[PDB]
Amino acid sequence: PNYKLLYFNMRGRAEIIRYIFAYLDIKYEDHRIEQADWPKIKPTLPFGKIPVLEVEGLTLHQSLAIARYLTKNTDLAGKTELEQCQVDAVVDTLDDFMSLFPWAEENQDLKERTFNDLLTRQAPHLLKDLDTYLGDKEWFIGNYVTWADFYWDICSTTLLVLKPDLLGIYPRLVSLRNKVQAIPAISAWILKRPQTKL
Amino acid sequence: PNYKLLYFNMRGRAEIIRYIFAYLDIKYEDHRIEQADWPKIKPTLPFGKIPVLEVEGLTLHQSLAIARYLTKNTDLAGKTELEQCQVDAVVDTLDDFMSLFPWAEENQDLKERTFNDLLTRQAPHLLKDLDTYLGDKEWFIGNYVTWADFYWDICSTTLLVLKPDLLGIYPRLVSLRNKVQAIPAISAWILKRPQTKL
Ligand SMILES: N[C@@H](CCC(=O)N[C@@H](CS)C(=O)NCC(=O)O)C(=O)O
Ligand SMILES: N[C@@H](CCC(=O)N[C@@H](CS)C(=O)NCC(=O)O)C(=O)O
Ligand SMILES: [Mg+2]
Numbered sequence: 001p002n003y004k005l006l007y008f009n010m011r012g013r014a015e016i017i018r019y020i021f022a023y024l025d026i027k028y029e030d031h032r033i034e035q036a037d038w039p040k041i042k043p044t045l046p047f048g049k050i051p052v053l054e055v056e057g058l059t060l061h062q063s064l065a066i067a068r069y070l071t072k073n074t075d076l077a078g079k080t081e082l083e084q085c086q087v088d089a090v091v092d093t094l095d096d097f098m099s100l101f102p103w104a105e106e107n108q109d110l111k112e113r114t115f116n117d118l119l120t121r122q123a124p125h126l127l128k129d130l131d132t133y134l135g136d137k138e139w140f141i142g143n144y145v146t147w148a149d150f151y152w153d154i155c156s157t158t159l160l161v162l163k164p165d166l167l168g169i170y171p172r173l174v175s176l177r178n179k180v181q182a183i184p185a186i187s188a189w190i191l192k193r194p195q196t197k198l
Numbered sequence: 199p200n201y202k203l204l205y206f207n208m209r210g211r212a213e214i215i216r217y218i219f220a221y222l223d224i225k226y227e228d229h230r231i232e233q234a235d236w237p238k239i240k241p242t243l244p245f246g247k248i249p250v251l252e253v254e255g256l257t258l259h260q261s262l263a264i265a266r267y268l269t270k271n272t273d274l275a276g277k278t279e280l281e282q283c284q285v286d287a288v289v290d291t292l293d294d295f296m297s298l299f300p301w302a303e304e305n306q307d308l309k310e311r312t313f314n315d316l317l318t319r320q321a322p323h324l325l326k327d328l329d330t331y332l333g334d335k336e337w338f339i340g341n342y343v344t345w346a347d348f349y350w351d352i353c354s355t356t357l358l359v360l361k362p363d364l365l366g367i368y369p370r371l372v373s374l375r376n377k378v379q380a381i382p383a384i385s386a387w388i389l390k391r392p393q394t395k396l
């Protein structure tokens with residue numbers, strides 16, 4: 001159909017949707033909002049947040065709800081209902097952590113304090129658990145890629161911008177990034193996407 | 199098959215799973231752990247958090263992933279893939295907001311100030327968006343109940359503990375929670391469940 005993605009000019013919370021469109025070879029409009037235009041756009045959206053995805057005029061919201069929609073009936077979702085649950089759960093574990101960062105906090109001293117606590121004290125526990133769950137499997141679920149693996153590439157890319165040595169203990173998690181990035185459609189998207197900090 | 203739900207003796211993040219089991223008439227073990235026994239249990243769980251659900255020898259985690267698993271192929275999920283997206287999205291919008299509350303904060307002055315700000319300043323924006331989305335529909339999605347409606351009853355029950363007058367000006371949201379509570383399986387569970395603050 002006709003797809004229009006609306007987000008800021010960032011990877012951020014839209015990037016999972018962008019990976020899925022690339023992987024499934026689905027054409028879409030990648031509409032990027034400049035910051036100064038956001039007050040104009042915000043009241044037009046159902047819950048006042050981005051990303052949203054318009055599908056033939058119907059506006060969907062919530063990045064992970066949308067990602068899950070786009071992967072319905074594909075192997076990327078998980079091949080069984082139990083595996084779909086495992087995929088969903090890894091995604092929400094990652095998203096829970098990323099959602100703790102006070103990205104819009106105005107007080108920079110409090111913002112940095114929270115970022116530091118998250119990156120220094122809390123992140124090692126997440127990483128240990130992700131690495132234990134992955135084990136020596138090829139991908140999070142087993143022997144095939146799912147959108148949870150995509151979400152790890154995306155989240156880790158941003159965490160690495162914030163803390164460049166983040167993955168220094170976990171080469172299996174690095175190998176997982178490398179495997180996702182080597183998928184030809186993903187590799188091509190990474191080469192062509194706008195270079196933004198976040 | 200030997201469904202065993204592990205959580206604290208609270209509604210909290212297990213309650214959505216408990217509503218779904220009630221509605222679908224699925225027998226399960228509702229295992230509640232006292233705070234004192236949590237330190238020994240925590241390291242045995244792949245991601246160190248509760249709730250978890252034991253299902254066919256697997257330990258599933260993430261309350262909403264588990265809820266989605268239990269509702270797969272039922273009308274509670276949403277009947278079409280677009281409706282499933284809308285259900286998923288309302289649930290994540292609610293969960294995003296409830297996750298802002300610093301439930302585990304030990305500085306009680308800070309906790310109270312944050313709670314009060316959320317309830318006073320932020321909640322009207324969320325509640326307006328939810329009320330507007332519901333409109334005059336019978337249920338969030340339209341003409342049938344979904345687990346998004348359940349999640350509204352669950353979230354709102356705790357919000358009303360925190361601020362009894364909160365829904366005074368949202369009669370449609372009051373009506374929705376009353377409609378959910380009047381579903382016989384939900385009524386039965388509400389009458390049976392342990393009385394806890396949260
Ligand atoms: N869990 C939601 C979060 C949506 C969200 O909060 N998006 C931010 C931008 S990353 C936003 O729109 N913030 C409100 C604002 O800036 O007015 C999702 O993944 O879609
Ligand atoms: N988004 C997760 C959150 C899970 C979570 O954070 N659970 C808390 C209890 S409500 C926990 O286990 N905290 C860690 C601890 O208490 O050690 C879910 O809905 O399952
Ligand atoms: Mg979430």
Ligand SMILES: [Mg+2]
Nearest residue numbers: 334335336373
């Ligand atoms: Mg009505």
